[PDB]
Every structure is written in C-alpha cells, then in structure tokens.
Structure 1
Amino acid sequence: QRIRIRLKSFDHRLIDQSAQEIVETAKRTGAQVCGPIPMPTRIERFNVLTSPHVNKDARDQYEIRTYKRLIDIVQPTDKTVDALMKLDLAAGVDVQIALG
C-alpha cells in the first residue's frame, strides 16, 4: 500500500531537514521511496501602515510563505511504518500521511 506523506511549514530549513531525516529513516529498514518532491509555495503578503496617525506612503510590506513537500513510500514493509510513527516531528513542520 502507498504512503503519501505531505509536509507543510512556514520555513524551508525545517521542512527539508525533516524530509531528509525521514527518507533515510525508511530507507534504513526498507526501500521503494520517491523522495521529497518540492511543490510550489504559497506566498501571501501584507501592507501595514506604520505610523499611528497619517502617512499613506510609509508602509511595512510583509510576507508569509508556506512551503509544501511530497514524499512517496510505495510498498513499505511491516517493519517500516512502525518506525515512521516512531519518530519525533519537530515544531514548525506539519506532516499529514495518507494511504494513497
């Protein structure tokens, strides 16, 4: 059975480290992995007036980026998914797992 693991984060130094932390993890007691594909990132921006009273031109322009990554485990063993949920996922990275 297939295991599609999708990673989400607000930072990429976290999502990539978690992905290459779990890929090796599986590949140690199994195989048939399709690596962390990088999926296009969402980037939503904001304008914030910075003064208290009246200055339309003075604005801090901010961003927030959500990065997403794909990971395929095609036919893992029965000694793999146990060690998959047996791994502590950091903060700032969310992982959602779906059996195909």
Structure 2
Amino acid sequence: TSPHVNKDARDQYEIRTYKRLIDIVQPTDKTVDALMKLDLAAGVDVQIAL
C-alpha cells in the first residue's frame, strides 16, 4: 500500500470464478431455438455443446 517502504502494509485482494452445469435431455424442437432466442446477460458467459 505504501509507495516506498512498508513491507507489512499490504492489502489482500481476491477474485472468485463460479461455474454451473446444466443438462437438457429429450430436447423438443422448440427447445433449441428458444435457447438461442434467450438473451445474454453481462457478466455471465455461456457455452453450449450438442
């Protein structure tokens, strides 16, 4: 934290990454097109695998 010399003066920061997994089984035809119609919210990244 200090600009020149204080070794014991530190700030401790952290960052967390959260993950979720979702499975879709027996997908109807409307399911897929609904999934691309679904909006994307900032701050959440989505990966879809077929």
TM range (shorter): over 0.9
Provide the TM-score with structure 2 as the length reference: 0.94
Q: Quick one: higher RCO (CA 8 Å, sep 6+), 1 or 2?
A: 1
Q: Alignment length, in residue pairs? A: 50
State the identity as a percent. 100
Paired with 2:2 and 2:34, the residues of 1 have a C-alpha distance of 53
What displacement does 1:64 show?
A: 0.4
Provide the TM-score with structure 1 as the length reference: 0.49
Deviations 1:51-79 (A, max 9, x none): 11011001000000000000000121111
More strand by share: 1
RMSD in angstroms over aligned alpha carbons?
0.6
Paired with 1:59 and 1:81, the residues of 2 have a C-alpha distance of 50
Q: Indicate the SS of the match to 1:60.
A: coil
TM superposition outliers: structure 1 runs of 4+ over 2 Å: none
Structure 1 stretches of 5 or more lacking a match? 1-49
What displacement does 1:96 show?
A: 0.3
Paired with 2:36 and 2:22, the residues of 1 have a C-alpha distance of 15
More helix by share: 1
**Which structure's CA Rg is the greater one?**
2
Structure 2 stretches of 5 or more lacking a match? none
Query: Is 2:35 aligned against 1:84?
Result: yes
